[PDB]
């Protein structure tokens, strides 16, 4: 019944592509840009076009989009034949890829039923693993059993096919023709793993994953370990319900509360005691954790290389403290936060290990906490019980912002920007004031470097704050006490973090003139030292206070920073 409907929908699709030219001068009336898009790709001949579904939804009062939307796999060769006819008539080795994007509804992986088999769908989630690129068959050259005649057979993207009749009436058999690869037609094919997002998982359920296939030039664009949105067709695989994607993208009273919260003067003092309401004391650790969520400029150059514009925070001290509580808070509050235990990790495990699949013994690359949650906080508990390989991988990931993986013949490098929250402990546990930080932390100098701030916590018997701490501990042990309660909730704090994140401040000249004298004053303490002083001062601490300056400028939402707010960062560096 669709044999006469396919030519009509082919005529409708080519009328949609033929009747719309470009009349977009002076932002006047709108008409679609497809003919100039074909005229632009005429030189490059890639034929991997992008057609918006929102721009296609206006014809036939949306009824053309609703009829194509359910019978997409049954109307796809008619659509590519209409596209081939319009590029054969408007323009003079021929492959084609039609991609649809920008659907008005975003569907999850748990709402996939069998009523949408063959229809188009928008699937969002996170990529868990990636496979190697492989040449897909396309069209093959079959030879007969007796004729030895060539037949150019066209596959239908399902499974290894086989002809039925020999074209030359020298034979009429149906026995096994033999395949031939000289006159055959290959291309890139990839199979990746998509999984359910962490914010839309049901209570007690498991984050069910699925494999999605991808062809054309939509391959080698999806980076592993990022939130992705695909648009494709639901195709069954012998059965299992897989997916085929054609479009890839790297996705991922309110202003009345935000304007009220940026006009006061005591916001930062409630912010340092509201970033961790379950912890008694430790304002410096809370200051570094609050300033370690938002960074500064990374592209501050004229040469062309990106710099480390992030804040690295590391906590040390005696055991049985509340320093892991911050670790349990970040991951329960920050959406871009991956937590690891340290001992249950490795080099490959941290970023991308390799695991085999038996269909051809082929490898796939599993990700990890590393290279996930970009521009967020990766928190590693027990940093000193890790090996040497993952710590030099962390140092290679901190020396350069990109990370390279060389395995099975393929080399792949990718962008990464994460802030490390490292929880460490000494070799004996108890922190002695007898020596330096290097001999007590027990780790080498290059991995000890590129760390903006160190937090040392020592405890003893001081009854006046100890009785308050024990009373806070026993008052916390009840059903949802008000003692823990902050001055304001996280409801406006999340949008405040995002509003301060999209601010991008610029430093001044008076701040730089006070900063050079402050660096001279900080380096003057190294002369006749060995008292309070415990480490060396070079360009890295200067870079740490420079990065803390724009973070306190963003936290106070000021476009031009004054040196009085950098004086608190100078006092924070002096407190450490």
């Amino acid at each position: 019944v669709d044999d006469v409907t396919g030519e009509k929908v082919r005529e409708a699709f080519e009328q949609f592509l033929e009747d719309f030219s470009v009349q977009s001068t002076d932002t006047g009336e709108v008409e679609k840009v497809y003919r100039a898009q074909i005229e632009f790709m005429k030189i490059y001949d890639l034929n991997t076009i992008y057609i918006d579904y929102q721009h296609l939804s206006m014809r036939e009062n949306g009824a053309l989009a609703m009829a194509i939307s359910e019978q997409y796999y049954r109307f796809l060769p008619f659509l590519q034949k209409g596209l081939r006819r319009v590029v054969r008539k408007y323009a003079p080795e021929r492959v084609f890829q039609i991609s649809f994007f920008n659907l008005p509804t975003v569907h999850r992986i748990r709402d996939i039923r069998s009523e949408k088999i063959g229809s188009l769908l928008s699937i969002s989630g996170t990529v868990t693993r990636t496979s190697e690129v492989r040449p897909e068959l396309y069209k093959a050259s079959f030879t007969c059993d007796m004729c030895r005649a060539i037949v150019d057979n066209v596959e239908q993207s399902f499974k290894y096919t086989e002809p039925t009749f020999c074209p030359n009436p020298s034979c009429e058999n149906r026995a096994f023709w033999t395949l031939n690869v000289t006159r055959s037609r290959f291309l890139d094919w990839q199979k990746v793993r998509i999984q359910e997002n962490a914010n839309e998982i049901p209570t007690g359920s498991m984050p069910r994953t699925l494999d999605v296939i991808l062809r054309g030039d939509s391959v080698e664009r999806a980076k592993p370990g990022d939130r992705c949105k695909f648009t494709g067709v639901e195709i069954v695989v012998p059965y299992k319900i897989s997916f085929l994607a054609c479009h890839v993208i790297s996705i991922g009273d309110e202003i009345n509360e935000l304007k009220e919260m940026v006009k006061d003067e005591h916001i930062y003092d409630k912010l340092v005691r509201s970033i961790a309401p379950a912890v008694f004391g430790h304002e410096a650790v809370k200051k570094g954790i609050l300033l370690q969520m938002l960074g500064g400029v990374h592209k501050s150059t004229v040469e062309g290389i990106k710099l480390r514009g992030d804040i690295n925070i590391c906590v040390v001290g005696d055991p049985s403290t509340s320093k892991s509580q911050f670790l349990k808070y970040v991951v329960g509050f920050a959406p871009r936060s991956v937590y690891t235990s340290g001992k249950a990790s490795s080099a490959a495990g941290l970023t991308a290990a390799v695991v085999r699949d038996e269909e051809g013994g082929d490898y796939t690359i599993e990700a990890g906490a590393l290279m996930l949650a970009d521009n967020g906080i990766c928190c590693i508990d027990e940093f000193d019980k890790m090996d040497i390989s993952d710590q030099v991988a962390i140092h290679e990931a901190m020396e350069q912002q990109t990370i390279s993986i060389a395995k099975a013949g393929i080399h792949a490098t990718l962008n990464a920007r994460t802030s490390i929250l490292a929880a460490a402990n000494p070799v004996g546990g108890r922190y002695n004031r007898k020596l330096s930080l290097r001999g007590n932390l027990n780790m080498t100098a290059p991995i000890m470097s590129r760390f903006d701030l160190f937090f040392v916590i020592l405890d003893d018997c001081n009854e006046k704050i100890d009785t308050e701490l024990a009373s806070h501990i026993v008052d916390l042990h009840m059903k949802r006490d008000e003692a823990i309660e902050p001055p304001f909730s996280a409801e406006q704090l999340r949008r405040y973090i995002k509003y301060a994140r999209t601010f991008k401040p610029i430093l001044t000249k008076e701040a730089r003139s006070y900063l050079v004298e402050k660096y001279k004053e900080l380096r003057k303490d190294d002369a006749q030292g060995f008292s309070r002083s415990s480490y060396r001062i070079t360009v890295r601490q200067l870079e740490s206070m420079i990065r803390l300056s724009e973070a306190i400028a963003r936290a106070n939402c000021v476009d031009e920073i004054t040196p009085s707010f950098i004086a608190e960062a100078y006092d924070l560096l002096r407190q450490s």
Binding site: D45, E93, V95, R134, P135, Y160, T178, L179, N180, V181, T182, F186, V297, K299, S300, T301, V302, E303, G304, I305, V354, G360, G361, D362, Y363, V392, E396, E399, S404, A406, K407, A408, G409, H411, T413, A445, P446, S449, I506, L507, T508, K509, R512, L515, V516, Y519, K520, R523, D526, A527, R536, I537, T538, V539, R540, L542, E543, I546
Partner: protein
């Protein structure tokens, strides 16, 4: 088709008539050299038959697979009527299509270049050789115990056979290659060269098939391969070989090099990110510009490269200079530690997991500069391989069935840190670094920085690094990097015995004064080093020969490296070298 029969008799008449120079048929000399030395490779230039018949060139550019079925047959027919019984030893003789005019890149390999001839440039890696590959298969069905067979080429893994003829079973099947096709291997992964890749983009890589041309290629070198595209099936290989000098830019380089003493301008153009000091960048510029290699009657090969060693506290910048020269200099390879970049300098036999076997590869820039970061943190293999490459200029591979001694004439820029962070100036460099003296003797220039407490450095460094963060006279970078490739590939400045003997007088003072006050001596390697530094400065000055005052800068470079590499107790040597300063 029968149209190949009128093609065959055309080129059969062509090989007996090609007389381009002095009426001599060069194909008779070519066929007698391939017949007397039992070769199977025939050489044909593209321009010769293209000037003769452009339709044969169009057929070779369109369908070379069917064009190659005529070439081997007419070559074997010419060899058979020129030499009797040549078919008893050699059944087939291939041809080598060279001189392809349209040299393509690896990023221009598209769908339109399928089933055609293409000449591409690259660098070869992953050497696996002389193995029998497949093209046909058979399979043994265990249930009934039967045989069935298809085809399998060089890209997929294998075509699973799971349906028997009469079993109709999903039983376990076994691979029979005991009736199967012949095998030939040369799986080589070729990559794009880093000296011609655009900025921001990554170099691509392909897989090449070599058949009938194994182990004549050297890994880690530039190569030119002409083959067919389908996975590239190479026909001809060339181990002799977009940012190059032109006619409009070469006159202005001599005009720039003639005026205003450009050596200091090149030094100021070396570090745009920081202020620095000239001791690191002077050694860096003379190491990247290099000297000249000379031999006497085929022997006594001197090293034309300059290997510099940086030292100092880890808070200073030592990796940014090599990161700038990795983008600036041509064929610069940044290698690190155990294998951060998954490529190294040392030969190795190792297992490979993608296909799970044993293989051999001699790692890696034969003309380039290799950059080593954190020199003190390495094992025994990568220290011995760089010591062999610093001692002489070759690396030998003596494993996995192959024995090859490859060229290792690369410059070495190494950076290191002392034991403990502090330099500890009241001790020499031999007690400071963990390295010994013969690995230190290969490095001619030993630059070392220290800590500056004073206001001067505080007034300049913090202000420049805050100027770099508050913002979001020299030679420009493009002209400098084009001048490097223009001077390193055209001139070779020698030395004349007119007044050069005076440096042998001053070395005679400078050697003797290192015994009485100092503990470490000065040898003939320092004399070879200052002659290389003076000829490198003459190369940068673009002169015909080395001048008389280039040695003054060369002796200043060796005094502020050797005297600075010692204790404070060689302080009298700071004033003893002031008479020649």
């Amino acid at each position: 088709p029968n149209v190949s029969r009128t093609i065959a008799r055309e080129l059969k008449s062509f090989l007996l008539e090609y007389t381009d120079e002095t009426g001599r048929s060069v194909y008779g000399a070519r066929i007698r050299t391939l017949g007397e030395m039992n070769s199977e490779s025939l050489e044909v230039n593209y321009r010769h038959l293209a000037e003769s018949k452009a339709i044969l060139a169009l057929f070779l550019a369109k369908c070379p697979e069917e064009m190659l079925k005529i070439f081997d047959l007419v070559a074997m027919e010419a060899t058979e009527l020129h030499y009797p019984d040549y078919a008893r030893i050699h059944s087939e003789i291939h041809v080598r299509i060279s001189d392809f005019p349209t040299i393509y890149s690896l990023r221009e390999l598209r769908e339109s270049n399928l089933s055609s001839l293409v000449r591409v440039t690259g660098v070869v890696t992953r050497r696996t050789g002389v193995f029998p590959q497949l093209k046909y298969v058979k399979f043994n069905c265990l249930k009934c115990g039967s045989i069935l067979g298809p085809f399998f080429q060089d890209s997929n893994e294998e075509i699973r056979i799971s349906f028997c003829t009469n079993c109709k079973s999903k039983g376990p099947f076994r691979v029979n290659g005991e009736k199967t096709v012949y095998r030939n291997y040369q799986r080589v992964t070729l990559q794009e060269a880093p000296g011609t890749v655009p900025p921001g983009r990554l170099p691509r890589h392909r897989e090449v098939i070599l058949l009938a041309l194994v182990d004549v290629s050297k890994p880690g070198e530039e190569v030119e391969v002409t083959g067919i595209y389908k996975i590239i099936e190479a026909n001809s290989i060339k181990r002799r070989e977009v940012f190059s000098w032109t006619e409009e830019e070469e006159r202005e380089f001599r005009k720039i090099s003639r005026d205003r003493g450009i050596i200091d301008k090149i030094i100021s153009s070396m570090a745009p990110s920081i202020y620095g000091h000239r001791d690191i960048k002077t050694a860096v510029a003379c190491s990247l510009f290099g000297g000249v290699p000379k031999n006497v009657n085929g022997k006594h090969s001197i090293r034309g490269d300059i290997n510099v060693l940086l030292l100092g506290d880890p808070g200073t910048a030592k990796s940014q200079i090599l990161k700038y020269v990795e983008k600036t200099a041509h064929r610069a390879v940044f290698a690190t530690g155990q294998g951060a970049s998954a490529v190294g300098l040392t030969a190795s036999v190792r297992k490979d997991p993608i296909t799970k076997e044993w293989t051999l590869e001699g790692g890696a820039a034969d003309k380039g500069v290799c950059l080593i970061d954190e020199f003190d943190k390495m094992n025994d293999q990568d220290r011995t391989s760089i010591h062999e490459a610093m001692e002489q200029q070759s690396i030998s591979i003596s494993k996995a069935g192959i024995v090859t001694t490859l060229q290792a004439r690369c410059s070495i820029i190494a950076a290191a840190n002392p034991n403990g962070g502090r330099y500890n100036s009241t001790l020499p460099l031999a007690q400071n670094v963990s390295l010994t003296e013969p690995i230190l003797s290969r490095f001619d220039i030993l630059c070392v920085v220290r800590d500056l407490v004073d206001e001067e450095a505080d007034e300049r460094l913090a202000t420049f690094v805050v100027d770099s963060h508050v913002r979001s006279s020299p030679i420009p970078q493009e002209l400098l990097m084009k001048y490097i490739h223009y001077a390193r590939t055209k001139i070779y400045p020698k030395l004349h015995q007119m007044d050069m003997d005076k440096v042998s007088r001053v070395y005679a003072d400078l050697r003797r004064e290192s015994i009485s006050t100092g503990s470490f001596p000065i040898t003939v390697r320092h004399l070879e080093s200052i002659l290389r530094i003076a000829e490198s400065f003459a190369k940068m000055r673009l002169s015909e020969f080395v001048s008389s005052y280039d040695l003054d800068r060369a002796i200043k470079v060796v005094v502020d490296s050797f005297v600075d590499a010692q204790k404070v107790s060689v302080r009298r040597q700071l004033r003893r070298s002031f008479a020649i300063y």
